[PDB]
C-alpha cells in the first residue's frame, strides 16, 4: 500500500477544510496567541485539524489493511 | 442550649406558656394581635426540647419552634 500518500492527503484535506470553510464557524462558536496568517489560523488549529487528518488517514489505512 | 423562636403569627392564646414543663416562655405586651399578647423565650438555657409548646400552639403553621441544638446538663433533663 501507499501510507505516505494516504496520510499526507488526509492531513492536507482536513487542514484545507479547516483553513477555508470551517474557520469562520469555529470563530463564531468560540466567541499560540498570534500568528501572521491572515485568517488567524494559528498553531493549535493546525494541531487539531492535523490530528483529525492523521486519525482519518490511519482509519482508512486500517480498513484498507483488513480489505473489508 | 436549644433554639426557641417566636413568630409574629402569635395570637396570644397563652397555650404554649401553660404547656412548657420547665418555665421557659412568658407573655409580653404587644400590639400585633387582638389579644395584645405575644410569647417570648427569655430562658432557653433551661429548655429541654420536649416540644409541648409546639403541640399547644393553634396557629397554622406554628408560631413557636424548637430547634434542637447543643446539649447541656439542663437540656438533657439529667437529675445527675
Amino acid at each position: 500500500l501507499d501510507p505516505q500518500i494516504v496520510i499526507s492527503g488526509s492531513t492536507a484535506a482536513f487542514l484545507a477544510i479547516g483553513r477555508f470553510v470551517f474557520l469562520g464557524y469555529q470563530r463564531r462558536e468560540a466567541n499560540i496567541f498570534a500568528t501572521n496568517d491572515p485568517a488567524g489560523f494559528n498553531i493549535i488549529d493546525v494541531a487539531g485539524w492535523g490530528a483529525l487528518g492523521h486519525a482519518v488517514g490511519f482509519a482508512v489505512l486500517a480498513i484498507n489493511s483488513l480489505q473489508g | 442550649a436549644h433554639i426557641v423562636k417566636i413568630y409574629d403569627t402569635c395570637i396570644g392564646c397563652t397555650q404554649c406558656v401553660r404547656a412548657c414543663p420547665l418555665d421557659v416562655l412568658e407573655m409580653v405586651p404587644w400590639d400585633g394581635c387582638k389579644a395584645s399578647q405575644m410569647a417570648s423565650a427569655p430562658r432557653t438555657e433551661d429548655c429541654v426540647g420536649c416540644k409541648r409548646c409546639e403541640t399547644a400552639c393553634p396557629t397554622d403553621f406554628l408560631s413557636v419552634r424548637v430547634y434542637l441544638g447543643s446539649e447541656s446538663t439542663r437540656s438533657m433533663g439529667l437529675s445527675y
Binding site: 496520510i7 468560540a30 | 409546639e54
Partner: protein, 732 residues
C-alpha cells in the same frame, strides 16, 4: 470542658457520653465544623482522598504479600483445576488439635484459609508465575502507598495548598482525567498485555530483565507505521492451546475472535488487548474536548445554556445548572455514586457471564463470592447516591439560582413522581405475591398443572436476537439470511455463537417462568427502593406535615408527638428505611443467581425450573437443602473445615437479632434504666469511690437507628456470605 472533639465546641461542652459517639459520627462532615471555610473544605477533602488512595494500595500490597508468603501460588499454576487457592495462614492459639488437623487442608504446613476472592486467576491471567513477582508487586505497592500518604501530608502544607480556583476548574480536570487517567492508563495496560501478559500465556517469560530484547510481534512497529494493522491479527491462538505453554500457540497480539478460550473458558487476551487499545484511543480523543488555556475547546456553561428546547417543555432548560454542579459537592458526590453503583452492577453482571480470567468459572465459589460482593457494594453505593442527593437539596440547592430550570420543575411535579412510583410498586407487589401464593396453593393441593406459568417471551426474544437457537424466533443473529449475521460472520460472530449456544456456561442462560417471576420481584424491589429514596430526596425541603423541614437539616430525630406524631420524618430516615429494601432486593438477586447457578453446576437445571415457580420450592430446595453441610461444620461427633462458616453463620444470625433490639425498642425505656443504674452505682459502697467522667445516658434516636441498621446489615452480610461460601465450597 473537654478537647475531643476539636471540630465542635458544641459537642465539646457536652457533659454526657453522647460526646464520644457524636465526635465519632461527625468527624468527616467537614462542612459543619467550627470555622470551616470553603477553601479549607476542598483542601481537607483532597488530602482525605489521598488517605483513601494510600489505604487502597496498602490493602493490595497486603493481599500480594500474604499470597506470596503463605499461599500456594507457585503450586496452583501447574494444576489450577484440582488445587485450592490459599489466602493466608492461621495462627489461632485458641485452637485444638482437631482444628489444626482439619484446617491443614493441602498443600500447607499448618492451618490456612482457602481464598474465594479470585486473586489467583487475575494474577495468573495478567502474567504472574512465581512468588517473587508477587513480592516485588507488594513492595512496589507499599512504596506507592507511602508516596500517596506523603502527598496527602504535603498538599496540606501552606506552600502547597491549592487555591479555590484550582478545585473549581472543571474543564482542565475533565480534560486531564479523561485523557490521562482513562486513556493513557488503558493504553499502558494494553502495553502491559501486549508486552508481558500475552507472551506469558505463550510460555515465554517476559520480565523487567528481558522486555527490551523480546519482540511482542515478529515484525515490530513496521505494520503499525505502515498502517498494515491487520498483520497484528494474523495467526491467533489455536482452539487446542494449553494456557501458559507454547503448544497450540499463535503470533497475534490484537485479535477480535469472540467467545471464550476453549481450555480456560475465559476471554482471549488479544481481545482484551484490542479492547483496551480501542477504548484508550477513544478516551484520549474524548479528553481533548473542553476549553483549557489554548483557545479551542467546549465551554460547559455554554453547552448547558444552549440545551433549552422551544415550547418551554423543560422551562428554562439547563440554565443555571453549571453553578449548582460546580458549587455543590453533594451534587457531584451523588452523580459519582450513581455512576459508580451502576458500573459496579455492570461489573458483576458482565463478570459472571463473560469471565475474563483463566480458570475462573470452574472455581464456582469464586464466581458466587465475586458476584455477591460487587452486587452488595453496588446496592450500598446507590443508596448513598440518593442520600447525598437529598443532602444536596437540603444544604446546597438555591431556588433563586434555579428559577425555572429542570431541577426546580422536578420539585414542581414531585407528587406525580411519588404517586407513579407508588403505583408501580403496589402493582408489582400485588401481582408477584399473588402469583407466588397461587402457585404455592396449587403445589399444596397436589395439582401443579393449574399454576400460572407466564413464559418470558420478551427476554427470550432478546436472546434470539443475540444468536441463541433454542427458542426458534430466528431473527437478526439467529437467522442465517440476516444482514447483521452475514456482516459479522467473518470476524467476531463464530466465537460468540459457539459460546452463546453452549448451555454449560453462564452466557445467556436458558430462562423460564421462575426467571419471569424473579425478574418481576427484582423490578418490585428496585421500584420500591427508588420510591423511598426519591421520596426522601424530594420531601427533604418539606412536606405538608412539616413545611419547614429544611430549617432542621438532614438528620434530626423527629418533630415531636404533635400534629398526629412525626416519627421518621427526615430524609436521613428515608435513607434508613430504604437500606432495608436494598438488602432485600440484593438478597433476592443473589438467592436467584446462586440457586440458578447451583442447579447449573450440579447438572439438573430442571430442579430450578420445577421448584422456582413457588416459594416453598425456594425454602425447601435452596435454603433447607443447601445448608446441610454448613450446619454440620461442627457437631458432637467432631468438626471439619466448614466449622468456621457454621460459627460465622450463627454469628450473623446473632448480630441480626441484636440489631432488632435497637430497631424495635426505643430510647426512654433505656434512659430510665440507666437512671436506675446511676442510682445503684452512686449508692453502692466501695465502688462509688470510682466515678465516671462522662455522664452515662442512653443512645439517641438517630444513633439508635444507625446502630440497629448497622448490626442488621452486618448480620445479614455475614449470614449470607457464610451460607454461600460453605454450600458452594462444600458441595464442589
Amino acid at each position: 470542658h473537654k478537647l475531643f472533639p476539636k471540630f465542635s465546641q458544641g459537642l465539646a461542652q457536652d457533659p454526657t457520653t453522647r460526646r464520644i459517639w457524636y465526635g465519632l459520627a461527625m468527624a468527616h462532615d467537614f462542612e459543619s465544623h467550627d470555622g470551616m471555610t470553603e477553601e479549607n473544605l476542598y483542601q481537607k477533602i483532597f488530602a482525605s482522598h489521598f488517605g483513601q488512595l494510600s489505604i487502597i494500595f496498602l490493602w493490595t500490597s497486603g493481599n500480594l504479600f500474604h499470597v506470596a508468603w503463605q499461599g500456594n501460588f507457585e503450586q496452583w499454576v501447574t494444576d489450577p483445576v484440582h488445587i485450592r487457592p490459599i489466602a493466608h495462614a492461621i495462627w489461632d492459639p485458641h485452637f485444638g488439635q482437631p482444628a489444626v488437623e482439619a484446617f491443614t487442608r493441602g498443600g500447607a504446613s499448618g492451618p490456612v484459609n482457602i481464598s474465594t476472592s479470585g486473586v489467583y486467576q487475575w494474577w495468573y491471567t495478567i502474567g504472574m508465575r512465581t512468588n517473587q513477582d508477587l513480592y516485588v508487586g507488594s513492595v512496589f505497592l507499599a512504596l506507592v502507598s507511602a508516596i500517596f500518604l506523603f502527598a496527602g501530608w504535603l498538599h496540606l502544607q501552606p506552600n502547597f495548598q491549592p487555591s479555590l480556583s484550582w478545585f473549581k476548574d472543571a474543564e482542565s480536570r475533565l480534560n486531564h482525567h479523561l485523557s490521562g487517567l482513562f486513556g493513557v492508563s488503558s493504553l499502558a495496560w494494553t502495553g502491559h498485555l501486549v508486552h508481558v501478559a500475552i507472551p506469558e500465556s505463550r510460555g515465554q517469560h517476559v520480565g523487567w530483565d528481558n522486555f527490551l530484547s523480546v519482540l511482542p510481534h515478529p515484525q515490530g512497529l513496521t505494520p503499525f507505521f505502515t498502517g498494515n494493522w491487520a498483520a497484528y491479527a494474523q495467526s491467533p491462538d489455536t482452539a487446542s492451546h494449553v494456557f501458559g505453554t507454547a503448544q497450540g500457540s499463535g503470533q497475534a497480539i490484537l485479535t477480535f475472535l469472540g467467545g471464550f478460550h476453549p481450555q480456560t473458558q475465559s476471554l482471549w487476551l488479544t481481545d482484551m488487548a484490542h479492547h483496551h487499545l480501542a477504548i484508550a484511543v477513544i478516551f484520549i480523543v474524548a479528553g481533548h474536548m473542553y476549553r483549557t488555556n489554548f483557545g479551542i475547546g467546549h465551554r460547559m456553561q455554554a453547552i448547558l445554556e444552549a440545551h433549552t428546547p422551544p415550547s418551554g417543555s423543560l422551562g428554562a432548560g439547563h440554565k443555571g445548572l453549571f453553578d449548582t454542579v460546580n458549587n455543590s459537592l453533594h451534587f457531584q458526590l451523588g452523580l459519582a455514586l450513581a455512576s459508580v453503583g451502576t458500573i459496579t452492577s455492570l461489573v458483576a453482571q458482565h463478570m459472571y457471564s463473560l469471565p475474563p480470567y483463566a480458570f475462573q468459572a470452574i472455581d464456582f465459589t469464586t464466581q458466587a463470592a465475586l458476584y455477591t460482593h460487587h452486587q452488595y457494594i453496588a446496592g450500598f453505593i446507590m443508596c448513598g447516591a440518593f442520600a447525598h442527593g437529598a443532602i444536596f437539596f437540603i444544604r446546597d440547592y438555591d431556588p433563586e439560582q434555579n428559577k425555572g430550570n429542570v431541577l426546580a420543575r422536578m420539585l414542581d411535579h414531585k407528587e406525580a413522581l411519588i404517586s407513579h412510583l407508588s403505583w408501580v410498586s403496589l402493582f408489582l407487589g400485588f401481582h408477584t405475591l399473588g402469583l407466588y401464593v397461587h402457585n404455592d396453593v396449587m403445589q399444596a393441593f397436589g395439582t401443579p398443572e393449574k399454576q400460572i406459568l407466564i413464559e418470558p417471551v420478551f427476554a427470550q426474544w432478546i436472546q434470539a436476537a443475540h444468536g441463541k437457537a433454542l427458542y426458534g424466533f430466528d431473527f437478526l443473529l439467529s437467522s442465517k439470511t440476516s444482514a447483521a449475521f452475514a456482516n459479522g460472520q467473518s470476524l467476531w460472530l463464530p466465537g460468540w455463537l459457539d459460546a452463546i449456544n453452549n448451555n454449560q456456561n453462564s452466557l445467556f442462560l436458558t430462562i423460564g417462568p421462575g426467571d419471569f417471576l424473579v425478574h418481576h420481584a427484582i423490578a418490585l424491589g428496585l421500584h420500591t427502593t427508588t420510591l423511598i429514596l426519591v421520596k426522601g430526596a424530594l420531601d427533604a425541603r418539606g412536606s405538608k406535615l412539616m413545611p419547614d423541614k429544611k430549617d432542621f437539616g438532614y438528620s434530626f430525630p423527629c418533630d415531636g408527638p404533635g400534629r398526629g406524631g412525626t416519627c421518621d420524618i427526615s430524609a436521613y430516615d428515608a435513607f434508613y428505611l430504604a437500606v432495608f429494601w436494598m438488602l432485600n432486593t440484593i438478597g433476592w438477586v443473589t438467592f436467584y443467581w446462586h440457586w440458578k447457578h447451583l442447579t447449573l453446576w450440579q447438572g439438573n437445571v430442571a430442579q430450578f425450573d420445577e421448584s422456582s415457580t413457588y416459594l416453598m420450592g425456594w425454602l425447601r430446595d435452596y435454603l433447607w437443602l443447601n445448608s446441610s453441610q454448613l450446619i454440620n461444620g461442627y457437631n458432637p461427633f467432631g468438626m471439619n473445615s466448614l466449622s468456621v462458616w457454621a460459627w460465622t453463620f450463627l454469628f450473623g444470625h446473632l448480630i441480626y437479632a441484636t440489631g432488632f433490639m435497637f430497631l424495635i425498642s426505643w430510647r426512654g425505656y433505656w434512659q430510665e434504666l440507666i437512671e436506675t443504674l446511676v442510682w445503684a452505682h452512686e449508692k453502692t459502697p466501695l465502688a462509688n469511690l470510682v466515678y465516671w467522667k462522662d455522664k452515662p445516658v442512653a443512645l439517641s434516636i438517630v444513633q439508635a437507628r444507625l446502630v440497629g441498621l448497622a448490626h442488621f446489615s452486618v448480620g445479614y452480610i455475614f449470614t449470607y456470605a457464610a451460607f454461600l461460601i460453605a454450600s458452594t465450597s462444600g458441595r464442589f
